[PDB]
Amino acid sequence: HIVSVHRNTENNNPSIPFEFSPENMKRAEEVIAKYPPQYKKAAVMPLLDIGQRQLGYTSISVMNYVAKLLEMPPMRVYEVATFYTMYNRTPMGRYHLQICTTTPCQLCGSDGIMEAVQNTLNIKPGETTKDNLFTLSEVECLGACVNAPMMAINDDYYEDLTPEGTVKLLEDCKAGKMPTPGPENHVRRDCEPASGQKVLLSKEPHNVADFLQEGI
Amino acid sequence: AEIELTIDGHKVSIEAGSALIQACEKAGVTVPRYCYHDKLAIAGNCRMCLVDVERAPKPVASCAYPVAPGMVVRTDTERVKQARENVMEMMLQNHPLDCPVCDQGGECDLQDQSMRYGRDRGRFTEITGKRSTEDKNIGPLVKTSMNRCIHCTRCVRFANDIAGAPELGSSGRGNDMQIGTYLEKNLNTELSGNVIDLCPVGALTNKPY
Amino acid sequence: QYGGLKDQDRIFQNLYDNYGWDLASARKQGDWYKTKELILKGDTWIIDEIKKSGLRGRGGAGFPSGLKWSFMNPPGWEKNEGPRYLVVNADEGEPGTCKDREIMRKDPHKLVEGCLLAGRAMNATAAYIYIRGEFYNEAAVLQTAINEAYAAGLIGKDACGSGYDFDVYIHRGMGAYVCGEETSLIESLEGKAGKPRLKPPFPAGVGLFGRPSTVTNVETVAVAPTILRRGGDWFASFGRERNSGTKLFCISGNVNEPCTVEEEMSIPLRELLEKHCGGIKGGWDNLLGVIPGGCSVPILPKNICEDVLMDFDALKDVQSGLGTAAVIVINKQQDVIRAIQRFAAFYKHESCGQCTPCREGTTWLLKAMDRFRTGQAKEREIDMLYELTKDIEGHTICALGDAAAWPIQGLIRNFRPEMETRMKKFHDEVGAVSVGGWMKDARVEKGKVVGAPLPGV
Amino acid sequence: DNVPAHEIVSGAPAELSRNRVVRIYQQAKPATQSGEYGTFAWRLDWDIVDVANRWENDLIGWQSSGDYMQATQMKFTSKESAIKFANKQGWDFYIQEPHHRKFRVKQYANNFVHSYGKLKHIRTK
Amino acid sequence: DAYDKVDFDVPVGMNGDCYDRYLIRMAEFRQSLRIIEQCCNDMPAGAVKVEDFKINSPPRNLMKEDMEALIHHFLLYT
Amino acid sequence: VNPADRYLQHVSDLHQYAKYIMAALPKYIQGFSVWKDELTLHVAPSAVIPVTTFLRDNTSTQYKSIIDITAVDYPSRENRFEVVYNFLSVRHNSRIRLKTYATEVTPVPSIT
Amino acid sequence: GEHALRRYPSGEERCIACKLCEAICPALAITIDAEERIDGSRRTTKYDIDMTKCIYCGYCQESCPVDAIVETPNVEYATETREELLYNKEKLLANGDKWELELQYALDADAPYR
Amino acid sequence: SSYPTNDIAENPYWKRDHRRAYPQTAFFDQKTVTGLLELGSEATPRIADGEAGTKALANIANGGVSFTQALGKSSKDVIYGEVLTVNGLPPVAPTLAPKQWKIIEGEAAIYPKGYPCRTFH
Numbered sequence A: 001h002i003v004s005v006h007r008n009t010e011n012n013n014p015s016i017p018f019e020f021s022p023e024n025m026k027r028a029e030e031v032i033a034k035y036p037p038q039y040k041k042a043a044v045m046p047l048l049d050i051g052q053r054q055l056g057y058t059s060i061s062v063m064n065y066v067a068k069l070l071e072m073p074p075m076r077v078y079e080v081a082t083f084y085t086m087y088n089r090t091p092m093g094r095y096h097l098q099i100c101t102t103t104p105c106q107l108c109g110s111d112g113i114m115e116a117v118q119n120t121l122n123i124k125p126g127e128t129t130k131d132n133l134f135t136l137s138e139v140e141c142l143g144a145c146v147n148a149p150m151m152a153i154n155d156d157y158y159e160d161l162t163p164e165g166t167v168k169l170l171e172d173c174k175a176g177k178m179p180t181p182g183p184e185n186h187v188r189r190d191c192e193p194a195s196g197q198k199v200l201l202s203k204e205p206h207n208v209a210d211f212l213q214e215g216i
Numbered sequence B: 001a002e003i004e005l006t007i008d009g010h011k012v013s014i015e016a017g018s019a020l021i022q023a024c025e026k027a028g029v030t031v032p033r034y035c036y037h038d039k040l041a042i043a044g045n046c047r048m049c050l051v052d053v054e055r056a057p058k059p060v061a062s063c064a065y066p067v068a069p070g071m072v073v074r075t076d077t078e079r080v081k082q083a084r085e086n087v088m089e090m091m092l093q094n095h096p097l098d099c100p101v102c103d104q105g106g107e108c109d110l111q112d113q114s115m116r117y118g119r120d121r122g123r124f125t126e127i128t129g130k131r132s133t134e135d136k137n138i139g140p141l142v143k144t145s146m147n148r149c150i151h152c153t154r155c156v157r158f159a160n161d162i163a164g165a166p167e168l169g170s171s172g173r174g175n176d177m178q179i180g181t182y183l184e185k186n187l188n189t190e191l192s193g194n195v196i197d198l199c200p201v202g203a204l205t206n207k208p209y
Numbered sequence C: 001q002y003g004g005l006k007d008q009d010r011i012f013q014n015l016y017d018n019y020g021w022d023l024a025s026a027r028k029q030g031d032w033y034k035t036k037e038l039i040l041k042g043d044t045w046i047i048d049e050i051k052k053s054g055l056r057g058r059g060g061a062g063f064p065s066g067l068k069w070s071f072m073n074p075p076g077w078e079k080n081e082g083p084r085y086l087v088v089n090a091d092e093g094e095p096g097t098c099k100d101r102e103i104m105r106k107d108p109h110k111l112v113e114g115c116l117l118a119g120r121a122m123n124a125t126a127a128y129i130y131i132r133g134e135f136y137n138e139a140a141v142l143q144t145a146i147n148e149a150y151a152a153g154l155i156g157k158d159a160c161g162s163g164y165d166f167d168v169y170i171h172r173g174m175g176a177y178v179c180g181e182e183t184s185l186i187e188s189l190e191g192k193a194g195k196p197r198l199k200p201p202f203p204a205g206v207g208l209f210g211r212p213s214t215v216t217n218v219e220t221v222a223v224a225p226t227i228l229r230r231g232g233d234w235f236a237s238f239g240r241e242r243n244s245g246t247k248l249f250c251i252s253g254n255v256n257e258p259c260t261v262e263e264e265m266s267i268p269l270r271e272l273l274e275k276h277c278g279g280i281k282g283g284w285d286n287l288l289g290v291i292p293g294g295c296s297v298p299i300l301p302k303n304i305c306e307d308v309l310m311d312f313d314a315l316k317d318v319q320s321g322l323g324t325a326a327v328i329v330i331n332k333q334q335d336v337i338r339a340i341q342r343f344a345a346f347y348k349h350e351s352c353g354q355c356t357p358c359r360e361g362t363t364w365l366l367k368a369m370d371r372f373r374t375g376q377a378k379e380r381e382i383d384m385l386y387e388l389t390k391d392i393e394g395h396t397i398c399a400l401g402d403a404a405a406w407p408i409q410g411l412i413r414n415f416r417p418e419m420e421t422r423m424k425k426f427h428d429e430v431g432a433v434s435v436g437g438w439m440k441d442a443r444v445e446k447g448k449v450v451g452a453p454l455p456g457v
Numbered sequence D: 001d002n003v004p005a006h007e008i009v010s011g012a013p014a015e016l017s018r019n020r021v022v023r024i025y026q027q028a029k030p031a032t033q034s035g036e037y038g039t040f041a042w043r044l045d046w047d048i049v050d051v052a053n054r055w056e057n058d059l060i061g062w063q064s065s066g067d068y069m070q071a072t073q074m075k076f077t078s079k080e081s082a083i084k085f086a087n088k089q090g091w092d093f094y095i096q097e098p099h100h101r102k103f104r105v106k107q108y109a110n111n112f113v114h115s116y117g118k119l120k121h122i123r124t125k
Numbered sequence E: 001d002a003y004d005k006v007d008f009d010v011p012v013g014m015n016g017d018c019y020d021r022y023l024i025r026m027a028e029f030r031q032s033l034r035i036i037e038q039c040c041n042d043m044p045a046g047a048v049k050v051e052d053f054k055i056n057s058p059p060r061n062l063m064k065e066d067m068e069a070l071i072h073h074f075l076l077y078t
Numbered sequence F: 001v002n003p004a005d006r007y008l009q010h011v012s013d014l015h016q017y018a019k020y021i022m023a024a025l026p027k028y029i030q031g032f033s034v035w036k037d038e039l040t041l042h043v044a045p046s047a048v049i050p051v052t053t054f055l056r057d058n059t060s061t062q063y064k065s066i067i068d069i070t071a072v073d074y075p076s077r078e079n080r081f082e083v084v085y086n087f088l089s090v091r092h093n094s095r096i097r098l099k100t101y102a103t104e105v106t107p108v109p110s111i112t
Numbered sequence G: 001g002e003h004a005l006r007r008y009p010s011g012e013e014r015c016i017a018c019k020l021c022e023a024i025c026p027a028l029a030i031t032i033d034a035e036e037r038i039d040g041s042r043r044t045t046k047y048d049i050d051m052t053k054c055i056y057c058g059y060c061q062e063s064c065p066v067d068a069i070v071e072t073p074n075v076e077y078a079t080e081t082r083e084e085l086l087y088n089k090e091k092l093l094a095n096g097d098k099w100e101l102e103l104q105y106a107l108d109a110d111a112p113y114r
Numbered sequence H: 001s002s003y004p005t006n007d008i009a010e011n012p013y014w015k016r017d018h019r020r021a022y023p024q025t026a027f028f029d030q031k032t033v034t035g036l037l038e039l040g041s042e043a044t045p046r047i048a049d050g051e052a053g054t055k056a057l058a059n060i061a062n063g064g065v066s067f068t069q070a071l072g073k074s075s076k077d078v079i080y081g082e083v084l085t086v087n088g089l090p091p092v093a094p095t096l097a098p099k100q101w102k103i104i105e106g107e108a109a110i111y112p113k114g115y116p117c118r119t120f121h
Ligand SMILES: NC(=O)C1=CN([C@@H]2O[C@H](COP(=O)(O)OP(=O)(O)OC[C@H]3O[C@@H](n4cnc5c(N)ncnc54)[C@H](O)[C@@H]3O)[C@@H](O)[C@H]2O)C=CC1
Pocket: C058, C059, C060, C061, C062, C063, C068, C071, C091, C092, C093, C094, C097, C180, C181, C182, C202, C203, C204, C215, C294, C296, C321, C322, C323, C324, C398, C399, C403
């Protein structure tokens, strides 16, 4: 579901003060500059993203600070923050496991990936580890269906997965070290048939300039 | 200046740029609605007011379709009736069975237009049941039973535009979209009592009454 | 015969990333060679080359692109002061669609040059590229490339020295597939929840920030500079009439080697599959059906998909559409009803919840699909479900409702026997079911329903 | 103009035409509903009498009344017809002229008008 | 009603006096007994009230489970 | 099935019959109305005796039985009351309705 | 026969002051007042039936959506003065408590036909 | 319940909504019967096209022709076909369901021969 009500706790409470770090500030100036001067409320989404970067999650203090900064009524900021799912309104931890479970993913074993993650971490998809160190999430299409078994950690994609390989990825993450930045145990460079390239077998690309319309 | 069009055979003349529903009202043709109101911005989210215009392939929202010269409008086509039934069927799917206990009862637009345009019976018998919604405290004047909200945004439109009280709004997305303040805040304005009249269903109600 | 595109005829060589995306590599490809003279040429020439090309929006709409950009310029365009605007729909989210990701990651400069070229055609002052948020790394890639273009001076207040002003920005959406809709997109850019507006007014008359704006897919803009350079007639040569050019064809599902390639339009399915993706896992006998285009399009049956053609027209004739050419294949091992139920769950999660038909109908469709996946239903509820789809189809504010209704209708049209077999499995195996999944001893006790499976708890 | 007392052939009490005042009007558009079906007829009903309107029985708590017209209300198709009827009966009346909504042009596109200066308010939808 | 689906005769007097009317009533007794037997033998199955809940109230098992039926019941009785 | 459909041919017959009656007494019949199986003749108060005699007594009508007589108070009309006569023709198995109007001071001719 | 107001097995009243019984009653026998109970429930504060206006038609019982007002099979309640025939809430609840078992018999027998 | 009324998948209520397809009451005044006499009927027209037809309708709807003049101008064909019967006889008071009486005599009668009460079927 989507939780659409905020209940004040001692953490994540309006009285808690949230201010942008000076670097985050300068970045906020730079991002507000892009939109017209009168329409600077259009920058709420990037500003909320900056807040969720500085602090772990999108708290009510972050929402109100952004609302004050763009002189918007906090209710508009609340509508924005609750409308978009990439805004995380509860605190999580260091790594945020996001399994894609749309049909192309399942047709290639995202149930196996899901089981592997759930066996390694007893937690349910919504829950987080008692160490807070991992947080799982079932997610819709992440836009890399060419690699049907795939997953994301915080911002990086990890694709063409295997259950026996998803466990190994997990423990490498648990130790603290990141095994690979590349999406997979290297089997392809990210879009070509596993049998290797079938087209574009030329050492140098043809210039477009050889073909001219004569229109100039 | 004033332009000309035909609605259900009749001939009705209306100022250019007006909405089709204003033309229908002027011409004596009754169109059902929920989200449209004469004093509020046009919203077009209820989809109750659909009509057929010969130029468009699909039925058009009458509250938000601007009039044009020579337009031909039919409010009584079989497609229109089927459309109203479909819209009502969908509207009542998650509506609570609260009429004996709803204060609106006997003066509820959902009742009257379901009786006039909807089907005699229902098709929704799902073992998973209906959606339910938290109740929200917005002060000692306006009692809230948000299970009944049909999401017409009249309350939001009024509170924002007319009374200048922006604490009211819609949070969440899709099925879980809830009218409220997203946190405990009173609907604080001297005109608040009017959302009681604007809310077509019993979601917002006079509390001392 | 259609297909087998020549490597020299391929639009962008960088799909495979061997050459590189550096600005110097794009110069090697020939990008930005002639921008000065293209800008110098009158906007009418750009739009008229497009009209000669027969370009249609490959985001999936198919509305003729040349005419669409024409509406941006009304006769008295000069009178309406204020900034004209252009918007690019980088928010691909259609399940199965990965083409736009390849376009932005592999060939970033072509997009920015096409943005400037189309903006010249539409006299736009600035552009906004709206990227979905999970797309982080290629948002960085694109931003790097746009920085290079600024530093070179090819994009900016002085574009190639022509005296034509253009600014190009990146806006990131955050996890809302409805924002791909052009008007939801405009709203999200403005700083509200991405709830679509009603059309009319169309984006051209009233659009971004109240200003005349146009929303276009990334790859249709991307192909534009190459189209202008190589000429309209050459582009028309590929693909059949009214379906001309070469599109990206992401292929996913139960093929032996999933792929991403570009190919002539109007190629046959069988040839496309066996040549690019090593064929269906198990061979053509082992094919249940194919979804041409993303999840929004009705599924094709095995018998008819043998002879079907990949233009808009043939797929529309067999009662489907190209969409974003995101073919998904399902073999005989896989369950079709499970897939369609997952699509219904996707649309339930993706509805913005503004208009009552979509808002209350996607959840009904999910609730019905779960019971059909277990078989916990009567066989007349199939016809009921069909009518439930028709409740949504024509009555919503935007086409997300159409997309929600369609996959289920395709399922009913092609695989009703499968549903009937699974309902027999529920009846003999578990018990006799009434409408909506109730059973003989299904009752309400102390706050819950006991006595019945209740699919999708 | 007005029928005097004692040539009315109805047989009603004289007090009805002597010291009672009726009111003629059209019902107002209810604020609670958007329907307008009740607002076209011209009602005629009697203004209340102070002493005889309603009191509370001292046994079961009921609403006692001595005004025999408290529940009566006629419907007419038109204002002139109601006037003619009241005159023919000899009833003193008052006309309450109806109020209607002043027409204004409403455009959906007006919600998205570009603003050249500072935004006066954030529309939200 | 079902006076066309049933078989019965009509007694008619000739003198128009109290005695003929008595005979008529006494024979209408018999004809009524005949009709009652025919309806006892031919009572069909199906609904007993018109099946449009906009006219007649819905059965209470619908009224307590279905939204449309509850609305129609409310309005019909108010 | 729509229950009004069973009356279509009979409604046509009643129309033909009413046309004949109007043509026969153009001095008296101000109009008729037909609804399923009930035919109404509208006449002025002075026309009542002639029209009732014609109904009772013509060979093609023979409306021998008076069924009821009543008034309906329409306070919007200038003439408040409309007097209704129902007749029955046992000869032909047919009924007819005849209307007039009156006021609180103008009488109607008695048909006793 | 005579009228009685029913309870839930938990002993909470069933009448929720929906006043449909008041609206349908062809003799205008029923008089009802209501307001928010101290615990927030919608309940009646006055429910009278004038048993000398009632025509014992049973509409009030068909109308109530929670089966709160019912008509017992009791006919033996003749009184010596009229004031005993003006039932208030307390009397009608007492009748319900007293006749609940017989009411359950009649309900078990006829509920499928309502 | 009875099929197809109880169907969950093919009955739209407006297709079986008999209350609101009720027959309107058809009021015919002397002007309308006139118009029928001169200009004929929709089933069998006796009217010219163009402006001529509309102006004929207009001047009958204004009072140009009275009912008596209408009847006088009326030919033999129209009187016999459309006021009287094709044979020239007046129409008989219509009956919805004609009842043909039969008299039962003998053993099947209710009373024996003597009594002054007969059996009609
Ligand atoms: N690219 C993707 O990932 C996805 C795209 N789609 C595609 O979206 C399509 C439907 O999108 P819609 O917006 O409903 O399409 P549509 O048929 O309404 O066309 C959209 C465009 O039409 C233009 N237009 C049409 N008439 C116009 C006029 N008179 N004046 C100015 N502009 C006019 C508008 O500017 C607008 O941008 C489907 O065919 C579907 O395949 C749907 C799902 C995913």
